[PDB]
């Protein structure tokens, strides 16, 4: 209907707000942009589905995401990806895993205090009958 199209429209001005607030705090700027090929040749021999900010502003444009459920496994998986990545105990390592955890629950309070619990469930119903 268009009702429900106007409720994933909705869905997307949300999603993109979240994400920009995240993309300009300086402390996730290594989140922002894929990770360069040439600088780390390594990187993709290691983590299977790379993922960045950059790629989730994108991806709400191209209608991949139709709950806010479906958007956090992305922000859960750039967290992920950069402790399996860093994992030792020297401070460059450290500061990278702080960062990650740090936009992770950045991400999680924003969506507890700003989405309203009925408009997350009304996508995830009109998802389930498509």
Do not use: W
């Not at 994992?87 to 992770?104: E, N, S």
Request: hydrophobic share 35%; charged share 40%.
């Amino acid at each position: 209907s268009m009702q429900e199209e106007d409720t994933f429209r909705e869905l997307r001005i949300f999603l993109r707000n979240v994400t920009h607030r995240l993309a300009i705090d300086k402390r996730f700027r290594v989140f922002t942009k894929p990770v360069d090929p040439d600088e780390v040749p390594d990187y993709r021999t290691v983590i299977k589905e790379p993922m960045d900010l950059s790629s989730v502003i994108s991806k709400i444009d191209l209608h991949k995401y139709l709950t806010v459920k479906d958007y956090l496994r992305d922000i859960d998986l750039i967290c992920s990806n950069a402790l399996e990545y860093n994992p030792d105990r020297d401070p460059g390592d450290r500061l990278i895993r702080h960062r990650a955890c740090a936009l992770r629950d950045t991400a999680y309070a924003i969506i507890k205090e700003e989405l309203d619990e009925d408009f997350e469930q009304l996508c995830e119903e009109i998802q389930e009958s498509r």
